[PDB]
């Protein structure tokens with residue numbers, strides 16, 4: 001005897017037999033009934049097929065674990081596999097705080113894994129009829145966490161036969177191809193995968209709220225967005241309230257917008273390669289990211305090796321904005337960019353960081369904030385705010401979260417320009433205690449312990465985070481609200497939390513400028529008042 005079950009899918013059950021002694025991880029697919037006769041053959045088509053080949057984005061076989069081996073409620077064999085450790089991709093997709101879907105890069109991991117998974121399969125003629133976030137494992141990985149496609153109970157071999165013919169479990173996703181039960185080619189995996197990614201980013205699709213058979217002609221009645229009543233929507237042209245970049249929302253609105261349809265949909269502009277290098281190009285892309293401290297804010301760049309600071313400058317120029325000779329470009333803390341070295345060096349993409357960029361002037365202080373439309377009137381009204389606030393309510397804080405991540409990304413946007421002082425200050429401070437032992441000793445320790453004064457104020461200093469926790473709770477106290485009692489058309493609490501997040505993004509903001517400007521005049525007319533004390537407080541001998 002050995003341990004517990006795992007779940008349903010395909011022609012039967014999956015089992016977790018944690019070995020009696022050695023402690024291996026064994027997972028068995030077994031047949032449900034006797035379910036004869038050609039399915040009795042086709043199950044043995046499958047088993048041989050799942051053994052045939054392997055690669056680290058889909059599981060491999062295991063053979064026979066002789067703790068009992070074949071106990072069985074059948075006169076029919078079994079298939080055994082490796083059990084792995086991070087669960088289903090859904091179990092993760094399910095996380096309370098992973099609301100609003102992903103704002104990730106593990107998305108990246110995901111796509112580029114499942115892609116290389118799927119490719120394999122079609123290169124090997126194995127159209128995996130479906131694809132479930134339920135059939136995918138976020139496997140723990142030492143280098144970078146791994147994805148492994150599973151559950152091959154439903155595939156077309158093309159050359160030897162089919163696998164099942166059932167829609168067992170939860171249909172929910174999948175293409176017309178099988179929904180209409182019509183004739184089909186590979187095109188379907190693109191659907192599943194695409195609609196997988198759509199979820200991987202948003203948490204939804206166009207769409208799943210309205211069940212399925214049943215939405216079968218919410219088939220944009222078609223490449224477009226769609227309608228509501230209060231607030232429902234079934235769209236693929238532009239996703240809503242979730243970050244990833246400003247140019248992977250590129251990808252989406254082009255990658256998804258291609259492979260999310262029926263019968264030959266591939267990117268109409270190009271006889272390229274679909275599931276393939278179409279994705280990986282728009283994936284592998286080397287990303288630069290300038291933060292303009294004029295709070296013209298974020299920029300973003302597709303940079304090679306044949307492009308160094310020289311090239312980077314010209315871009316910052318023609319954006320938002322301003323010419324080249326007022327351009328301080330600080331790599332995190334300290335160093336500028338050095339210099340005729342390709343930008344291919346300062347990107348760094350996911351394992352366990354940013355170009356901030358500054359100006360030469362007096363100081364101006366701009367707020368101006370990110371937002372989503374399906375949040376606009378959500379505060380100025382309690383508008384029959386129905387059962388589903390697992391859209392709005394979550395979104396509330398994910399818009400508040402975005403603000404945190406912004407002040408945060410201006411704390412390290414500004415207090416990354418005061419290390420430009422601390423170094424410059426002391427380098428040009430105590431060089432005047434080795435070359436100041438020597439009469440006009442007036443403007444030596446006077447403009448030294450006064451524009452050290454306007455330097456000591458800022459180097460140790462402390463609402464909004466005290467507010468993230470109040471969001472952290474409520475917009476969780478909904479899933480943690482039982483199946484009953486929920487429904488009353490009620491908004492209320494969220495409103496203030498947003499405005500108080502705004503009432504911080506109007507104090508945290510300008511009073512980072514009373515750190516900024518007090519290090520832009522205390523860097524110029526502090527370290528430019530040195531050349532007339534450097535080698536003017538020298539010639540007296």
Ligand SMILES: O=C(c1ccc(Nc2nccc(-c3ccc(Cl)cc3)n2)cc1)N1CCN(CCO)CC1
Nearest residue numbers: 006014027028029081082083084085086087088137
């Ligand atoms: O936490 C998981 C989970 C975590 C990971 C997975 N994915 C996973 N990984 C390694 C081997 C396998 C596996 C190994 C062999 C086979 Cl034949 C089928 C699946 N699946 C699937 C589920 N849960 C939560 C508890 N559930 C309820 C109790 O089973 C099951 C799903």
